[PDB]
């Protein structure tokens with residue numbers, strides 16, 4: 001893949017974050033706190049899950065960014081509609097406005113409905129995410145394995161502005177405290 005040249009500088013939007021998340025000063029790293037982070041509630045915040053959105057909104061063009069997932073046991077990554085539900089329980093699916101992959105219990109899966117098994121020989125430490133708005137494509141790349149393709153959602157019906165999407169996962173096990181980090185360009 002030669003998507004690197006569509007690289008965009010993504011920053012996290014504090015106002016969307018679950019109240020337990022801790023976003024770094026530079027707005028490039030997020031991790032699960034061990035408690036409520038002493039913020040007011042608002043209608044933007046994801047209530048049920050440790051999720052946060054990027055600040056950037058995309059309605060055209062080609063966009064690429066990379067996320068570091070080193071030593072995490074669980075996470076969700078991708079893009080979503082700006083108008084996704086924030087409160088209560090929901091599934092990550094294109095019907096609900098999400099184009100995502102995840103790691104969960106030692107398996108990788110794409111957020112289709114129902115979910116699709118991914119085939120990854122080299123556990124990734126960094127994930128590349130490519131969006132082509134006009135083409136209706138979201139693709140995921142294994143940066144650790146020379147940029148090998150993980151998954152392509154095609155014929156996507158975005159139906160609105162897109163935002164980068166993150167879930168750091170719960171840390172019930174004590175083995176999932178590590179942050180998600182936006183990697184430098």
Ligand SMILES: CNC(=O)[C@@H]1CNCCO1
Nearest residue numbers: 076090091092102104115
């Ligand atoms: C349909 N399933 C989901 O939405 C979640 C996403 N997080 C990992 C487990 O599955």
